[PDB]
Amino acid sequence: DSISLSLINEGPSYASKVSVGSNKQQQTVIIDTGSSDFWVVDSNAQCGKGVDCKSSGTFTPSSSSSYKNLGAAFTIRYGDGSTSQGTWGKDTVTINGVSITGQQIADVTQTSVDQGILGIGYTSNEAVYDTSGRQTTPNYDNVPVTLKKQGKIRTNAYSLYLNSPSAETGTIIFGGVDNAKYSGKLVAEQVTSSQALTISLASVNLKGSSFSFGDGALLDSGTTLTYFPSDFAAQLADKAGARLVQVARDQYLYFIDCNTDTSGTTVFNFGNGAKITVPNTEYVYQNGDGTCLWGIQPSDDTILGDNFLRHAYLLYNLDANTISIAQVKYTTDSSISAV
């Protein structure tokens, strides 16, 4: 069976409404293929300095009759350095009316993130370790696994439709696919890590020139922009006219002139002949002050974030270890089938 869930385009992130507890407390949480844990902002949390973290729903464990404490510490650090911490528990999770019982989640009492995060990646990427390198609580069934085990979906799989850059909403379908929302055929690509939702990216064609890559790229709904290894990003920046700026002690970001020509397209070539094309508007990110970030940035990690993913329809299949991709077709027409 399938569960369609609306994605709110928040700007940097895409979020959905998900209820927790016996009393179905609504949380608005980021849908994140790049992490694997579902955590919620406790109503008694302390937000980090400068962070409005209690405006997107909060969770009061003491008002849920079904909340169970697991007696284990939770800590996570994300790629941008933000963190959350709390403790592990289990409770009922409800997604567009469909409830799963005894779902392990983290009750977060301190965070520098604006809202909770629903991590839907592989169980092997759960944040269950401490800074010593020891595992402090075991790996567990995260939301997609539990949806399968409780009979709500047939297969641990979900389709991602972020929709166009201007769209207010997109859709994630757990256990289904909307065959109206792409052109060509969905091409299954093998996932290249047992822990991360990466597929092999063969090359990037930018301003008409090919740049060979040949390494995995994380298809991360929870990243705003696109990240490449420093050397490769610098080659692309030399072609694009982007400028590397030291913005803090150990952070560097590419900027680009806000009036840059964005008439062209950037092409991403994957396995089995698959290609995704991205309009170049996606690489000029307005800062609102007459400066613009480039949509590609340096990192040790390769990540194709939302500025890529808006242009693909993706069927992530965590049971098969494939991600099937096709050029998106923006349409309200819908032809949904279970997977």
Binding site: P12, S13, I30, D32, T33, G34, S35, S36, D37, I76, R77, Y78, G79, D80, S82, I117, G119, N125, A127, D220, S221, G222, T223, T224, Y227, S299, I303, G305
Partner: peptide, 4 residues
């Protein structure tokens, strides 16, 4: 942002 960059989500782990």
């Amino acid at each position: 942002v960059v989500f782990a």
